[PDB]
């Protein structure tokens, strides 16, 4: 019936809408793992810098002595 047409339409379209909000959320989630990846990369590079820092400190230390 025409009423049946409209019923399936609103239900199916709201279904696709909900799925699509799911995937837009999933896109934000992907950009979030991205941000986490850059932050972890920066943290690891900073750790390398700090360890090199301590090594330089020691070397110049007994250079001064």
């Amino acid at each position: 019936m025409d009423a049946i047409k409209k019923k399936m339409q609103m239900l199916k379209l709201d279904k696709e809408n909900a799925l699509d909000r799911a995937e837009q959320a999933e896109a934000d989630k992907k950009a979030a793992e991205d941000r986490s990846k850059q932050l972890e990369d920066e943290l690891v590079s900073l750790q390398k810098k700090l360890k090199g820092t301590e090594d330089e400190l020691d070397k110049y230390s007994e250079a001064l002595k």
Partner: protein, 375 residues
């Protein structure tokens, strides 16, 4: 008529005329743009014997009338025909007098400026509308979608237009009109049905076959593979019950008719499919926003009631464009009324009466004032 002096909202779409009052959700008087005239002369008396027949009257009297189109692909044949059909719409169908209500009209994209000047002049002289505004149907469909970013595919009955609009700004440099529309669809289907054994020329069968297109037609996911499996296809082949009662069976033609817009080489167009026309349109403009255009494409028109445009659209654009960002189409149900809805939206706000085209402005500067008053 409402006690308030609210405006008239009329969409003279290329294929359908939808008219009503401002503040209404749907147009009240909606009729196809066919016009019937007496096929022969008058000798009888007692009834009928009327020249112009419009609306459902002509639909019922299709067989006795030569069915003519006052507009085709935007071109105007006879302004008297529009005069009569507007008289019918305003008084016999809308039961309204245009004296007390300003009119908001929608026009086909890139309509002639001379056409606008002549139609406005004949309108103002013939009618007594207090005020005027005319707008492109593209921004109307945009308003119906309510999102300032996107490319509008307006598939009327005479022309298909691709228009990009970013953040509510028109991009005429990337707007194109394609001469493929319902007329072509009916023609191509006519020749295929001729190759199926049924050869008709008159307009009644034109309406029958467009009804068939409305009901049974497919948009093929893969073309040659689907005719290959449609060789026999007892289940896939589909039938229709024509009003005379004969059962007419059609198979691959269901998805071989809309394919022609996608594959124009079937009946000889240099222009490629409409997806190529959306693609070129997109690249003509700056690179960066193109992704948003990919993700914000909108389609509008009565044809859109058919299935298959969405899946075909996305798949081919993803084939042409890189598949990093996800492309999704949006199309609200019953979007052929959407333009008229947007017209009501225009009358909703209180700034709209700042730029009504009043009678005295036209009396001062002639029709030429619209050249400065709309754009």
């Amino acid at each position: 008529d409402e006690d308030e002096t609210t405006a008239l909202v009329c969409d003279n779409g290329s294929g359908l005329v939808k008219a009503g009052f401002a503040g209404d959700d749907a147009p009240r008087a909606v009729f196809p743009s066919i016009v019937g005239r007496p096929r022969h002369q008058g000798v009888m008396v007692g009834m009928g014997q009327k020249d112009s027949y419009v609306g459902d009257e002509a639909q019922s009297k299709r067989g006795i009338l030569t069915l003519k189109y006052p507009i085709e692909h935007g071109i105007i044949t006879n302004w008297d025909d529009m005069e009569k059909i507007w008289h019918h719409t305003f008084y016999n169908e809308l039961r309204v007098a245009p004296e007390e209500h300003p009119t908001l009209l929608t026009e086909a994209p890139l309509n002639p400026k001379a056409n606008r000047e002549k139609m406005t002049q004949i309108m103002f002289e013939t009618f007594n509308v207090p005020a005027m505004y005319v707008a492109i149907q593209a921004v109307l469909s945009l308003y119906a979608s309510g999102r300032t970013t996107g490319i509008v595919l307006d598939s009327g009955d005479g022309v298909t237009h691709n228009v990009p609009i970013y953040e509510g700004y028109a991009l005429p440099h990337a707007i194109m009109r394609l001469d493929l529309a319902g007329r072509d669809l009916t023609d191509y289907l006519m020749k295929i049905l001729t190759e199926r054994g049924y050869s008709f020329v008159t307009t009644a069968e034109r309406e029958i076959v467009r009804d068939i297109k409305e009901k049974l037609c497919y948009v093929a996911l893969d073309f040659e593979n689907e005719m290959a499996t449609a060789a026999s296809s007892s289940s896939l082949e589909k039938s229709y019950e024509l009003p005379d009662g004969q059962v007419i069976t059609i198979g691959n033609e269901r998805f071989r008719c809309p394919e022609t817009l996608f594959q124009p080489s079937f009946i000889g167009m240099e222009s490629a499919g409409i997806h190529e026309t959306t693609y070129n349109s997109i690249m003509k403009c700056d690179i960066d926003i193109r992704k948003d255009l990919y993700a914000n494409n909108v389609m509008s028109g009565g044809t859109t009631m058919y299935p298959g445009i969405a899946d075909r659209m996305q798949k081919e654009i993803t084939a042409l464009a890189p598949s990093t960002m996800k492309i999704k189409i949006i199309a609200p149900p019953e979007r052929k009324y959407s333009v008229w809805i947007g017209g009501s939206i225009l009358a909703s706000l209180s700034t709209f009466q700042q730029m009504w085209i009043t009678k005295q402005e036209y009396d001062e500067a002639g029709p030429s004032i619209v050249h400065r008053k709309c754009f």
